[PDB]
C-alpha cells in the first residue's frame, strides 16, 4: 500500500472523567429569559471519557479507527496547533466518496472526492537549522484522487507553526454530527491555561457552519502531524518527533437538556432530565430552585431480557403453484374454489413463477402478512 | 444532458446558490411522471429552499411506480432509502431515443437484492452476493445463489412496463437556515415602524419591524419568542436583525 | 481401520422389518459423520435418513412415520430400524461423511464434504 | 418422491471447460450456501471432487472448479481426460437444515 512507520510504544490506555461539557445551540430559535428543553444528540454530564496520549519528547503516535457512531464530541488541550485533520470514509480505495478536512499551512482545505488511503496517513513538517522556517514537507494523506464532488479552500493565510514544548494554553472544542447526511461543525476556542487533563467549568458553545455534505459516514479518523529536526535520526519511517497533545473523544446519546437564558439570550445554565432522579423533577416543573416538597414522576419500566417466538410444529407447504397458472382454471360466474390450511404461506414467493401486474391487498399491508398467523 | 448513472450507483449532483423554477421544466423534455411528496407544485417557487442534491438514475418501468417513501421492494429496500419524513419531489421520463438500443443495453447494470438492510443516504460499492437463506455463497456465476447486478434488455421492440425511465429526486429542506435557492420574485424597499405585512424568504406575516437590540452570531436566521411565532429576522442583504411585534 | 462397514442384511417381506448396521472402524461415531445417501442406478438419489441425536424437530416431509432409528455412540456403531419397508425402495445405500466448519479444516469457510463412504449391502423387499 | 432438474446428458471434448447446474426455486436466492458436487463410475458408491463452491478441497486436483450467480450456474468441469466419463450431483438445502439435490448429470467424454 504505502510507507510504514516503527518506534511506536504503544501503552495501555487510561479513562478520565469529564466535567459538563457538550451543550450547544440546538436550532435556530432565539430565546432570551425563557426556559425551553429538546429531544436530541447530546452529551451527558460526568461521562468516563477515553484519552490518547501522543508525548514524544514518549515515543506514541496514535490515531485509532473508530467506526462513526451517531454523534461526536471532540475536546483538544493544544499549545502548539498540533491536531491539523481529519478524514471521513468507510473503505478508503479511491472509490468511496470521502472527506478530507485539513488545516493546512496556506488554507483550510474541505475535498469531497475519490481517495486511495494508506495505512496510517498524516502531516509532517520540516525545521531548518540556518533559519527559522517551517513548511509541509511530508503529505501521506493519499494515493490517487480521479472522481470528485466537493472542494472549498479557506483564505491564503500564514501561522506561526510553532514547535515549542510546554503547558496547554488553547483548547479546541468541536462537536461532529451527522444530520439528513449534513455535517454540523461547533467550533470553539478557549483560552486555558493548566498542564494536564481537562478542568472544571462551563461556557456555552458556539456553532461554526454547517457542511451540506450528504455522504454516508460510517467510520472516522482524527489526523495528526510530526516535527522533523535534527534530533531525528535522519529519516521519516522510523525517525519522528510528534510533540505533546492531549484529545478527549465522546460518543453522543439521544439525550435532553433544559436551558437557561438570560436577557442577551446566552446559554448559562443548563441542567439534565435523566441523571440522577433530582434532574427530572428540576426540569419537570420549568425552573431551577424548587419549594420544598414531593412531585411526580415517571414509573418503573422493565426491558425485555428475552424475545421468544412459540409456533406449532409445522413443516407442510402450501402450494401455490397449482394456486397460480398451474394448468387451466374455472370462469367466473362457475367460480373456482380452492381449500388451503395446515401449511406454510408466503408472498415473497409469489414472484418467481410469474411476474404479476395487479396485487393489491385490501386492508393488509403485504409485507406483514408472513408475520400473522393465518 | 449527456448520459446518467444506474440506480446501485446513483448519481449525485450538488446544487445551491442560484434560482430555481418548476414552469422551466416543460420546455427542453415532456415529462410522465412528476410526483412532489408532501409539496404542491404550484408552491415551490414560493418557498427558498437549502442545499438541493439531484440523485438521478435510470430503471425499468416495471419499478418505476414502487420507488415512493416509507414502501418495501426490489430496489426500494435495498439499492436506495427514502426517508420516511424526507420533503422533496421524485420526476420519472421516458427515453428511448438515447436508453434503448436495437440489440439492447448492456453497459448499465441493476441490483435487485442486497444482504443487509440500508439506512438513509446510502451507496453501496461492493460486489457481494445473494443468496437464498443465511451463509452466503459469494457468487461467481453458479445457480441458487444470486449475483446482484444483471444488465437490462431495453429494446425498441419491448414493452411499455419495459421502457427506459430516467429518474431523478429533489431532495431538499426549509425553515432551517438562511438559504440561497430561491426564486424569481423580485424584492423591493425596505418599510420600519409600520404594520405591514413581509416576506424573508418564502416566510410570509403582518406585523410591525422595529430595530434589535442583541448581539447575534453571524449564521442566525430567524428566532422565536415564547408563542413560538417569529419575534426576529435577519436582513437578507444589509444582514440587520429586526424585531417583530 | 477408518472404515465404514455396513451389516445386517437379510429378507425382508411384506408385512415385516429389519435391523440394518452402519458400524464405523477406527473412529467412534459418538463425534463423527454418518449420511445415508440412498442409490438406484440410472437416476437421481436422495439423502433421507434423518438422525442426528438429541431427539428434536428435524425431519423431512417424505417419510413421516416411515423410516425409525436409534442411537448408539459408544459401541461405534448405528442401527436402522426402518419398519415399514416399502417394495418400492430396491436401492443400495450408503452411510458416509461430511464436513462443517470447526476444526483446522475451516477456520473461515461453510465446509459439507462427503468424503468416506461404506460399502453398502443388499436388502430386497420382495413380496 | 422429491426431485430436481439437471442437465442428464453432457459431453465435451478433452481440454475443454462443461458446466453441470441442478434447480432451484426463489425460496433459494436471498442468503443461503450448501452446494457439493459429487463424481461416480456407475455401480458404485460416489466420491467427492468439489465441495465449498469456490474454495479448497484436501487432496484434489485444481482442475476443477465451481461457480455462482443467480439462476446462472457453473459447476465449470475444466481439463477433460478419459476418466471423466462419470456420474455428477449436486447438494443443496430445503430450509431448517433439511436437504435435497438434482437429477444426475451424466458427462460422456468424447475424442
Known amino acids: 500500500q504505502c510507507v510504514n512507520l516503527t518506534t511506536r510504544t504503544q501503552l495501555p490506555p487510561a479513562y478520565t472523567n469529564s466535567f459538563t461539557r457538550g451543550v450547544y445551540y440546538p436550532d435556530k430559535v432565539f430565546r432570551s429569559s425563557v426556559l425551553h428543553s429538546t429531544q436530541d444528540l447530546f452529551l451527558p454530564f460526568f461521562s468516563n471519557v477515553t484519552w490518547f496520549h501522543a508525548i514524544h519528547v514518549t515515543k506514541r503516535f496514535d490515531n485509532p479507527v473508530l467506526p462513526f457512531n451517531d454523534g461526536v464530541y471532540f475536546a483538544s488541550t493544544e499549545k502548539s496547533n498540533i491536531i491539523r485533520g481529519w478524514i471521513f470514509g468507510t473503505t478508503l480505495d479511491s472509490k468511496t466518496q470521502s472527506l478530507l478536512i485539513v488545516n493546512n499551512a496556506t488554507n483550510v482545505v474541505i475535498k469531497v472526492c475519490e481517495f486511495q488511503f494508506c495505512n496510517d496517513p498524516f502531516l509532517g513538517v520540516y525545521y531548518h537549522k540556518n533559519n527559522k522556517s517551517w513548511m509541509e514537507s511530508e503529505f501521506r494523506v493519499y494515493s490517487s484522487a480521479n472522481n470528485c464532488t466537493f472542494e472549498y479552500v479557506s483564505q491564503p493565510f500564514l501561522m506561526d507553526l510553532e514547535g515549542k514544548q510546554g503547558n496547554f494554553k488553547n483548547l479546541r472544542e468541536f462537536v461532529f454530527k451527522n444530520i439528513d447526511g449534513y455535517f454540523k461543525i461547533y467550533s470553539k476556542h478557549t483560552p486555558i491555561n493548566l498542564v494536564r487533563d481537562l478542568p472544571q467549568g462551563f461556557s456555552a458553545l458556539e456553532p461554526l457552519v454547517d457542511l451540506p455534505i450528504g455522504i454516508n459516514i460510517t467510520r472516522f479518523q482524527t489526523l495528526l502531524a510530526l516535527h522533523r529536526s535534527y534530533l531525528t535520526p535522519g529519516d521519516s519511517s522510523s525517525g519522528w518527533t510528534a510533540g505533546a497533545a492531549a484529545y478527549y473523544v465522546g460518543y453522543l446519546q439521544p439525550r435532553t437538556f433544559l436551558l437557561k437564558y438570560n436577557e442577551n439570550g446566552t446559554i448559562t445554565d443548563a441542567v439534565d432530565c435523566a441523571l440522577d432522579p433530582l434532574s427530572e423533577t428540576k426540569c419537570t416543573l420549568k425552573s431551577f430552585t424548587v419549594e420544598k416538597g414531593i412531585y411526580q414522576t415517571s414509573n418503573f419500566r422493565v426491558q425485555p431480557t428475552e424475545s421468544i417466538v412459540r409456533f406449532p410444529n409445522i413443516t407442510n407447504l402450501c402450494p401455490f403453484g397449482e394456486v397460480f397458472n398451474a394448468t387451466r382454471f374455472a370462469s367466473v360466474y362457475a367460480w373456482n374454489r380452492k381449500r388451503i390450511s395446515n401449511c406454510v404461506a408466503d408472498y415473497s414467493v409469489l414472484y418467481n413463477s410469474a411476474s404479476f401486474s395487479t396485487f393489491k391487498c385490501y386492508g393488509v399491508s403485504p409485507t406483514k402478512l408472513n408475520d400473522l398467523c393465518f | 444532458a449527456t448520459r446518467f448513472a444506474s440506480v446501485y450507483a446513483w448519481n449525485r449532483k450538488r446544487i445551491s446558490n442560484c434560482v430555481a423554477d418548476y414552469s422551466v421544466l416543460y420546455n427542453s423534455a415532456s415529462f410522465s411522471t412528476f410526483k412532489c411528496y408532501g409539496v404542491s407544485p404550484t408552491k415551490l417557487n414560493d418557498l427558498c429552499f437549502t442545499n438541493v442534491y439531484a440523485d438521478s438514475f435510470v430503471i425499468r418501468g416495471d419499478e418505476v411506480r414502487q420507488i415512493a417513501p416509507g414502501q418495501t421492494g426490489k430496489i426500494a429496500d435495498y439499492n436506495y432509502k427514502l426517508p420516511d419524513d424526507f420533503t422533496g419531489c421524485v420526476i420519472a421520463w421516458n427515453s428511448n431515443n438515447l436508453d434503448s438500443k436495437v440489440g439492447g443495453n448492456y453497459n448499465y447494470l441493476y441490483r435487485l437484492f442486497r444482504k443487509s438492510n440500508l439506512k438513509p443516504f446510502e451507496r453501496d460499492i461492493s460486489t457481494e452476493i445473494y443468496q437464498a437463506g443465511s451463509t452466503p455463497c459469494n457468487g461467481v456465476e453458479g445457480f441458487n445463489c444470486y449475483f446482484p447486478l444483471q444488465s437490462y434488455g431495453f429494446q425498441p421492440t419491448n414493452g411499455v412496463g419495459y421502457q427506459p425511465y430516467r429518474v431523478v429526486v429533489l431532495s431538499f429542506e426549509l425553515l432551517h437556515a438562511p438559504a440561497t435557492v430561491c426564486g424569481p420574485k423580485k424584492s423591493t424597499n425596505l418599510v420600519k415602524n409600520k404594520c405591514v405585512n413581509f416576506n424573508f424568504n418564502g416566510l410570509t406575516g403582518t406585523g410591525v419591524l422595529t430595530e434589535s437590540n442583541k448581539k447575534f452570531l453571524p449564521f442566525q436566521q430567524f428566532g422565536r419568542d415564547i408563542a413560538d411565532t417569529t419575534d426576529a429576522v435577519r436582513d437578507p442583504q444589509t444582514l440587520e436583525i429586526l424585531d417583530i411585534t | 481401520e477408518v472404515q465404514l462397514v455396513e451389516s445386517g442384511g437379510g429378507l425382508v417381506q411384506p408385512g415385516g422389518s429389519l435391523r440394518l448396521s452402519c458400524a464405523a472402524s477406527?473412529?467412534?461415531?459418538?463425534?463423527?459423520?454418518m449420511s445415508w445417501v440412498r442409490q438406484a442406478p440410472g437416476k437421481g438419489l436422495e439423502w433421507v435418513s434423518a438422525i442426528y441425536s438429541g431427539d428434536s424437530t428435524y425431519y423431512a416431509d417424505s417419510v413421516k412415520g416411515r423410516f425409525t432409528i436409534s442411537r448408539h455412540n459408544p459401541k461405534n456403531t448405528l442401527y436402522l430400524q426402518m419398519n415399514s419397508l416399502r417394495a418400492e425402495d430396491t436401492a443400495v445405500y450408503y452411510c458416509?461423511?461430511?464436513?462443517?466448519?470447526?476444526?483446522?479444516?475451516?477456520?473461515?469457510?461453510?465446509?459439507?464434504?462427503?468424503?468416506?463412504w461404506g460399502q453398502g449391502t443388499m436388502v430386497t423387499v420382495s413380496s | 418422491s422429491y426431485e430436481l432438474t439437471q442437465p442428464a446428458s453432457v459431453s465435451g471434448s478433452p481440454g475443454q471447460s462443461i458446466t453441470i447446474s441442478c434447480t432451484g426455486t426463489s425460496s433459494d436466492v436471498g442468503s443461503y450456501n450448501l452446494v457439493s458436487w459429487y463424481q461416480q463410475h456407475p455401480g458404485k458408491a460416489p466420491k467427492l471432487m468439489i465441495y465449498?463452491?469456490?474454495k479448497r478441497p484436501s487432496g484434489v486436483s485444481n482442475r476443477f472448479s465451481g461457480s455462482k450467480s443467480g439462476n446462472t450456474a457453473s459447476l465449470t468441469i475444466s481439463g477433460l481426460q478419459a476418466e471423466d466419463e462419470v456420474d455428477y450431483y449436486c447438494?443443496?438445502?430445503?430450509?431448517?437444515?433439511?436437504?435435497?439435490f438434482g437429477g444426475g448429470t451424466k458427462l460422456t467424454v468424447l475424442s
Open positions: 465449498e463452491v469456490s
Open positions: 458416509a461423511r461430511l464436513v462443517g466448519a470447526l476444526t483446522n479444516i475451516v477456520v473461515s469457510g461453510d465446509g459439507g464434504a462427503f468424503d468416506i
Open positions: 477406527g473412529f467412534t461415531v459418538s463425534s463423527n459423520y
Open positions: 447438494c443443496s438445502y430445503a430450509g431448517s437444515s433439511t436437504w435435497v
